């Protein structure tokens, strides 16, 4: 009925991959051609968002867009911003839990949630943990960032998460990071927690998606990856195939 | 199965009653009479907690004497502490939504998640929203206070709860406030969202309670209200017996 039940009733076979587009970096029509390359390769969703902050007819354009040469559902992922088209499918409604400003954890959500109750689109609630480096979206979310190694401290905010109702764990390495969260950090806080985990930020090789995903991460997100969008295809096949080999227990 | 599950199925008939104790003011021994005596007036849980910080020892005690002298489930009421005690069959796991300090909307409960999860008690996520006047919470909480008649901000942060994923969003006016938050707040909130209501502070009279149900709280909370344990029973129940009147359309 929802992706939220779309995505828990694939979790139990496979793991997930989502194909996240920045709406700011290509035109909706480039957004729309990798959309559909992505889709053959086999992502599951098409996220958009970003953290370069654009205006909503920019946002519905991309959205649109994406929906009309594809048949994925569109996520919307704000990260730290309001971004919001009432053309997707779904969006995050994420918390970045781990920030030093209120504004970050419910401000923007207090101030979005009229306008969301007023739409059709599904509010799936994704606890958002941003880690060292963290990038752009550590940096103007304000984020206490957790070390990757931390793996402590992860649990205790993945926890606390889990226990004030998200259904959702998004670990946030930010977009651009050199490498993702550790392997160790993933694997001890998914042994302990019952929601799925997300795991983006670094991800941009199939060795290093086989890796995160072996390690413990239920989802991968990825960006397109590939500088032109006639090689997007191969690279991200390469990559789906890989983490779509994994055996589920 | 769970608290939360026969929460959810008990409101389909009825409206609920909680009876509050709070471990500061009395012996566990008295808290114990009390729970008995609000047992028979009919509250479907004891709540035990305050805003009166004390040590892990009288916590352990009250809540045992109640359980040895009910058949009722406790649960814990942290409110803006980190107040537990593993004899409890469930804790609310509060996050002070309007808080101005980030420490009262995740800090506490990121502290306490680890050690939570080493225990079988029951996690509600439960959003506290302190309204107009607050009392002692909304001081100690540093609420942004939620004027009992600003209906719009309460829809606000009621839906961002929502859209966190909260279970169980409750209105709080503060332990001792002269009335509880109004009537056409509560009514215009629960108009628009799917989650229960709860409502606490300023319930202390058959007349209030049967208002506050009215209006569309799903569950109150109050205390035992009379002064001398030989009272309480007729006390509550001439408010619970109103409010379980009310037919559940």
Redesign the interface.
Known sequence: MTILKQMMRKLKNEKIHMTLIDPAAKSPDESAKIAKEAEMAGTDFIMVGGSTDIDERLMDQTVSAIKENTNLKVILFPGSSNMISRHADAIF?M?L??????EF??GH??????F??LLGIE?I?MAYLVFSPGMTVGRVGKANLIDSFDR?TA???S??A??????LIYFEAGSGAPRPVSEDTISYVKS?INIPLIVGGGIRDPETAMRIALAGADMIVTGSIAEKSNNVYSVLRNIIGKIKSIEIK
């Open positions: 409604f918390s839990l781990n920030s030093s400003d209120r954890i419910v959500q207090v101030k979005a949630s009229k969301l109750s509010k609630p402590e649990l205790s905010y926890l606390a889990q226990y004030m109702g998200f259904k302990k």
